[PDB]
Amino acid sequence: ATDRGSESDKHFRKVSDKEKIDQLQEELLHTQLKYQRILERLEKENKELRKLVLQKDDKGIHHRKLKKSLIDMYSEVLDVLSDYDASYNTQDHLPRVVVVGDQSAGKTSVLEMIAQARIFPRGSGEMMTRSPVKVTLSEGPHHVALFKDSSREFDLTKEEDLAALRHEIELRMRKNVKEGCTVSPETISLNVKGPGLQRMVLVDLPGVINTVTSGMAPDTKETIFSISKAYMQNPNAIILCIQDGSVDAERSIVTDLVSQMDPHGRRTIFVLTKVDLAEKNVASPSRIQQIIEGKLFPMKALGYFAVVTGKGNSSESIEAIREYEEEFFQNSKLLKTSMLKAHQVTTRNLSLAVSDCFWKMVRESVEQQADSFKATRFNLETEWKNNYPRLRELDRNELFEKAKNEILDEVISLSQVTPKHWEEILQQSLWERVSTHVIENIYLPAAQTMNSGTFNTTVDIKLKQWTDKQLPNKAVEVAWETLQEEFSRFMTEPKGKEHDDIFDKLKEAVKEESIKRHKWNDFAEDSLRVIQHNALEDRSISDKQQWDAAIYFMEEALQARLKDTENAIENMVGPDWKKRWLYWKNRTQEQCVHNETKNELEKMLKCNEEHPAYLASDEITTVRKNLESRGVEVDPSLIKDTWHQVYRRHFLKTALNHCNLCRRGFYYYQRHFVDSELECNDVVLFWRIQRMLAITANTLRQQLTNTEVRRLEKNVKEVLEDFAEDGEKKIKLLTGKRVQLAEDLKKVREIQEKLDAFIEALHQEK
Amino acid sequence: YLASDEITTVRKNLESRGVEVDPSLIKDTWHQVYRRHFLKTALNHCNLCRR
Amino acid sequence: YLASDEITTVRKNLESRGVEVDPSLIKDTWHQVYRRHFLKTALNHCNLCRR
Amino acid sequence: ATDRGSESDKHFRKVSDKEKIDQLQEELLHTQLKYQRILERLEKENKELRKL
């Protein structure tokens, strides 16, 4: 009966087991015992095994080194840096080649010709030219392509495999775009190999635009720039600024972006596309010599190159395009009249120049960055050792788990708090809540009568009205606030040295929510009405022990109000004479007036202690006139306030003297003696109220401990589950641990492996 | 706040006396005794702060 | 034998009076303290067996 | 540095890391790598519920 919810949960949990254990033991623990060990065999070993099947097709041993070209190994290096941190802050560490240019300028054809195959999709000329791809370029004995995330090898000399390759890229391309924008940053990684291909890694970035039309979002112009600027920021990048040769160089759009990362073109190269279509330029030195020497641009490049990207056909074969490129420059005026120099034309020269810079920079740069990222682990280890004693047990998610368990443990312990403490809290709160009605409305008007039956009648009328209307509602409010306040205390107590600040954030978020998901059963108001009445209903003090308990509670309740009245009267009337001459506590004029009015009312009460609270109005006039005669200024309001305080003091102190007489009042009642003024009936009232306070507190405690506290535990578990699923709450709560710093120390181990393995490959090769 | 070691050192010290004590008895008795000490000190500080 | 927590009560009474003490100084002091009590009680039992 | 608890803890950590790369542990890793292949490949067959 003390608690019932846990029994129900255990019962139905056992029933669920009895019916479904032959499945639940298999699903829940059997497999899960091995779950931590199963995943490496299930997924990692699977990725290796199929890669080993392709290595078996290669017929080269996986263990023995020199299995792959140094640049093919360097693609994995860049990929691991991208995975560890895709921001430019980490891209800056290693060489890259950026392929950027005006929209639909043929830059994709430039990259494909450098790759010696039509590897990228060209399905459309608007959305398919404004999305990124990345391709590594490697030496090989055969022109073959392989994705990071696929075991399939593509034959680059056949239309079917090139089409499938373009299809896979396209499937990634047409999805890695914000809706409407059609432009989003994302990584697609292909490794293209073959004879004549150089040691590079080229990133084709969304085509650059200057204006927006009805078929595109207005933001599209900015998003492209944001992507375009991202890879250009790399100080170790070779930036191929690819411009459409059919339009004025002064009108280049990409240039105005390149100048934001290299204002003078120090690390940039100029590429002139559509040379065999822009006849107005390739046939005239006055344009070409400026465009290719670096006089028509603000950019002073690493080099300047001219290429043929296709005769307006977005799907033209790369092989035919290269053959036509070699034929065109010989056909064109440009070679004869030396407007373009022989080393400034065709795919070969551009590829070789960028290859030499990039690859020589890569051999030196990878030798630096292995130690850079290993040094970053050493730098991460100084901070982590200094911030906290060496420890990695905790985690952001584990912070939620630990705060969850702390909260549920405190909620349970709350449910098993000694009940007696619950009743003590409820009893004291109830008395503080009710004493105002007890004395101001019930006792004060009732005990001024000269008949015990009228005392009890006034008391009982006020008690019936009060126990029916306000008192039950007040008790229910007290119980609600008691439960919520004790819950808050368990959630927040700074338990000395055993307190953990980190969890506090969750304790506040749950404490708020758990309270709002609980409501107290309103029916209590009616039950209390009955119960309260019953506790009052016992008006019979049968023996000395209950007589003394009754007198005790009456003395306590009346002494509190008497002390309050006496403090008010002392402030109102002023200091005593002793203070006035020993501490020079001189009275104010109001205090003197109040003192004289008090003296008037007090002589009246001293002569006749039976006087009721209410005076005649002509008496107020007589009090004013007698006060005016002696020389004291007084008005009916001063008399009424002074009267109220003074009569209450007289009333309560007379009640306590009646306590002093009740303590030894028993023989007079057996005599039925007629001259006996003493009748001790207030004692019964305060006895009844003490017992009613006890009964109300205990009933509220029982409702709390068997019905409401278990509902609170259920609501808290629901709140904790809802917060556990909420990723944002975990992000914005329980953020204090230093584990985040250690996560970098551990994660950069992939970059450390790729770089060192690449350097040892440089040492096996030379 | 009494830590669990402080509570246990009180529990066993009383068990050695033969008094039968548990962590909740001590936690609540400690709260009352400590608050008595703390509030009397606070009233002494009341008297001090006057000057 | 003193219960693992009986060592904790010996520590509390000593900690309250101002004596730094640890469970190893309670086990060594106790092994010598009970070797002596036991044997001297045995010899007093000799004194009583004699009659 | 002598008779310093933090220096003693750093000395204790350096000796502990060498034991972690002891030949016992190294042989354990080498044998475990083959043991990961041994009594393995049954798991992919086990996931199937058709027999069940």
List phi, psi (to 5°) of A199. -85, 85
Of B3, B24, B28, the CB nearest to A497: B3
**Token couple for A23:** 């499945």
Q: Are A585 and A575 in contact (CB under 8 A)?
A: yes
| SS3 call for A533 | helix
Amino acid letter for position A679: E
Are A496 and B2 inside 8 Å of each other by CB?
yes
The string of DSSP letters for A127-188 reads: STTSS-EEEEEEE-SS-EEEETT---EEETTSHHHHHHHHHHHHHHHTTSS-TTT-------
The backbone torsions φ and ψ at residue A146, rounded to the nearest 5 degrees and listed phi first, read -145, 135
The residues that bridge with A666 in the sheet, in sequence order, are: none
Report the interhelical angle of A682-703 vs A636-662 (nearest 10°).
90
Contact between A470 and A437 (Cβ < 8 Å): yes
Beta strands in A379-529 (DSSP E): none
Nearest to A701 by CA among A583, A533, A531, A586: A531
From the number of C-beta atoms within 10 Å of its C-beta (0-12, 13-18, 19+), residue A219 rates as middle
What are φ and ψ of residue A688, in 5° steps? -60, -45
Resolution (A): 9.7
**Residue A754 structure tokens:** 């790729």
Integer Cα distance of A137 and A155 in angstroms? 15
Positive or negative: CA dihedral A135, A138, A140, A146 = negative
Cβ(A242)–Cβ(A101) below 8 Å = yes
Give the alpha-carbon dihedral of A42, A48, A49, A55, to 10 degrees.
170
Closest CA to A692 of A485, A517, A466: A466
Sign of CA dihedral A753, A757, A758, A763: positive
Edge-to-edge strands of the sheet including A144-147? A153-155, A144-147, A189-194, A133-139, A200-204, A96-101, A237-244, A268-273, A303-306
Q: Are C12 and B6 in contact (CB under 8 A)?
A: no
- Compute the distance between CA of residue A503 and CA of residue A735 in angstroms, rounded to an integer: 9
For residue A276, say whether it is annotated as part of any ligand binding site. yes
Task: State CA A574 to chain mean position distance.
Answer: 59
C-alpha span between D49 and A471 (Å, rounded): 65
Supply the DSSP string of A240-261, one letter for each residue: EEEEETTS-GGG-SSHHHHTTT
CA distance A414 to chain B (A): 12
Contacts of A371 by beta carbon, 8 Å cutoff, 6+ apart: none
DSSP letters for C1-19: ---HHHHHHHHHHHHHHT-
CA distance A296 to A255: 12
**Which residue, chain included where needed, has tokens 């990725």?**
A47
* Experimental technique used to determine this entry: cryo-EM
Rounded CA-CA distance A437/A421 in Å is 25
In total, the C-beta contacts within 8 angstroms joining chain A to chain D are 9
Q: With a CB-CB cutoff of 8 Å, which residues 1-51 of chain B face chain C?
A: 8-13, 15-16
Report the alpha-carbon distance of residue A120 to residue A108 in Å, rounded.
8
CA distances from A56 to A48, A116, A373, A376 (A): 12, 26, 33, 37
CA distance B44 to chain C (A): 26
Interface test with B, best of A497, A499, A500 (most B CBs within 10 A): A497
Pairwise CA distance, residues A695 & A529, whole Å = 11
User: Does the CA dihedral A213-A219-A225-A231 come out positive or negative?
Assistant: negative
Query: For residue A357, how many C-alpha atoms fall within 13 Å in the half-sphere facing its CB?
Result: 20
In whole angstroms, how far apart are CA D8 and each of A390, A491, C50, D12, D21?
15, 40, 60, 6, 21
> For residues A506 and A400, is the Cβ–Cβ distance under 8 A?
yes
D36, closest residue in chain A (CA to CA): A41
User: Could you tell me which residues come within 8 angstroms of residue A617 by beta carbon, excluding any fewer than 6 positions away?
Assistant: A636
- Name the residue in chain B with its Cα closest to that of A493: B1
- Bridge partners, A139 (sequence order): A194
Closest to B3 (Cβ–Cβ): which among A418, A493, A496? A496
How far apart are the C-alpha atoms of A60 and A761, rounded to whole Å?
A: 16
Residue A554 to residue A559: CA distance in whole angstroms = 8
CA of C20 vs chain B CAs: smallest distance (Å) = 14
Site of tokens 């306000």: A470
Q: Do chains A and B touch (3 or more CB pairs under 8 A)?
A: yes
Rounded CA-CA distance A213/A220 in Å is 10
Angle between helices A617-630 and A636-662 (to 10 degrees): 100
User: Inter-chain contact B12–C12, Cβ cutoff 8 Å?
Assistant: yes
Pair A214, A176: CB distance under 8 Å: no
Contacts with A482 (C-beta within 8 Å, 6 or more apart), sequence order: A422, A425, A426, A429, A700, A704
- Is A274 annotated among the ligand-binding residues? yes
Give the pairing type, strands A303-306 and A237-244.
unpaired
Adjacent-strand bridge partners of A146: A153, A191
Q: By the CB < 8 Å criterion, does A264 face chain B?
A: no
Distance in angstroms (rounded) separating the CA atoms of residues D31 and D25: 10
Tokens of D51: 């027999």
Instruction: Return the closest-CA partner of residue A368 out of A755, A763, A766, A757.
Output: A755
Q: Which amino acid is at A581?
A: W
Query: Of A324, A331, A359, A258, whose CA–CA distance to A113 is shortest?
Result: A324
As to burial, measured by CB atoms within 10 angstroms (0-12 exposed, 13-18 middle, 19+ buried), residue A138 is buried
Q: Which of A482, A489, A510 is nearest to A413 (CA)?
A: A489
Residue A664 DSSP label:
T
Cα angle value A91/A766/A356 (rounded, 5°)? 50
